Amino acid sequence: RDENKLEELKEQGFARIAIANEPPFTAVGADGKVSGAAPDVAREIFKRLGVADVVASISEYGAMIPGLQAGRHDAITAGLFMKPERCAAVAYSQPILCDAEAFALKKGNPLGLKSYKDIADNPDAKIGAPGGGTEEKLALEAGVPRDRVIVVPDGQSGLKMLQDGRIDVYSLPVLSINDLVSKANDPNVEVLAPVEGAPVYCDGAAFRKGDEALRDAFDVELAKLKESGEFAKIIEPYGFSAKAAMSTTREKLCAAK
Numbered sequence: 001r002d003e004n005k006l007e008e009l010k011e012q013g014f015a016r017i018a019i020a021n022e023p024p025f026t027a028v029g030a031d032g033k034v035s036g037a038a039p040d041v042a043r044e045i046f047k048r049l050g051v052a053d054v055v056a057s058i059s060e061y062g063a064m065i066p067g068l069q070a071g072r073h074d075a076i077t078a079g080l081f082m083k084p085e086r087c088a089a090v091a092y093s094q095p096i097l098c099d100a101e102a103f104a105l106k107k108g109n110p111l112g113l114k115s116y117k118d119i120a121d122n123p124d125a126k127i128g129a130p131g132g133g134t135e136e137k138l139a140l141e142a143g144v145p146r147d148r149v150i151v152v153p154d155g156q157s158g159l160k161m162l163q164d165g166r167i168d169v170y171s172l173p174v175l176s177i178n179d180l181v182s183k184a185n186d187p188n189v190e191v192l193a194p195v196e197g198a199p200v201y202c203d204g205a206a207f208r209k210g211d212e213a214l215r216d217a218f219d220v221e222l223a224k225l226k227e228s229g230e231f232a233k234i235i236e237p238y239g240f241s242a243k244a245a246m247s248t249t250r251e252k253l254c255a256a257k
């Protein structure tokens with residue numbers, strides 16, 4: 001049942017995927033059509049594997065690995081960036097979506113916040129970030145106390161909290177912040193990208209550890225997409241660099257480094 005997971009999905013007609021609704025990584029249309037770069041790549045590979053559709057579930061990032069391990073979804077296709085800790089819990093594909101981290105800030109950046117350390121250093125500064133996300137962990141690792149790292153469910157709420165003064169900075173990947181701010185039409189909000197001292201991350205699709213045969217099959221198709229140039233045709237309209245993903249590997253991103 002673990003080694004024949006692909007057969008099960010093919011006979012099912014669909015894979016269940018976990019997403020967060022954070023353009024341009026993931027997005028949901030009014031009609032329910034899931035798109036964004038991660039679901040678009042995943043939908044194309046699954047189709048090539050003979051799985052006709054993807055069925056997307058929205059959750060906050062902290063719920064994704066748990067639900068995957070619990071067998072609730074078949075893959076996480078959400079821009080869930082690779083990290084040693086995550087790599088130990090799931091079977092990742094090779095890299096797909098790469099991005100740096102950004103801040104959304106008050107115009108003029110009055111608190112002079114340019115790094116996660118800057119936030120840790122100012123006891124007034126509160127940062128908003130998705131729960132269980134890389135930004136939240138980077139804030140905590142820089143020494144921002146738990147009570148100044150504020151969980152934010154989604155981008156529109158993060159911007160509203162920033163505008164309202166409930167947080168001083170909201171942090172997401174560069175492409176996500178730029179997309180959100182450009183749609184907001186708020187002259188009193190300002191983007192700093194990339195965050196100084198922050199790592200650049202890449203994601204991949206994540207599978208249950210026991211579903212390694214499905215991960216392999218997914219990876220065979222991903223490699224062919226990369227080789228043909230079809231990979232770039234899918235992700236680059238969303239703002240991603242195919243070169244960046246193709247310059248690295250799962251083992252390098254997952255290494256103790």
Ligand SMILES: CC1=N[C@H](C(=O)O)CCN1
Nearest residue numbers: 025078079080081133134
């Ligand atoms: C695409 C994205 N990845 C982060 C992560 O993998 O934790 C959370 C904020 N947005």
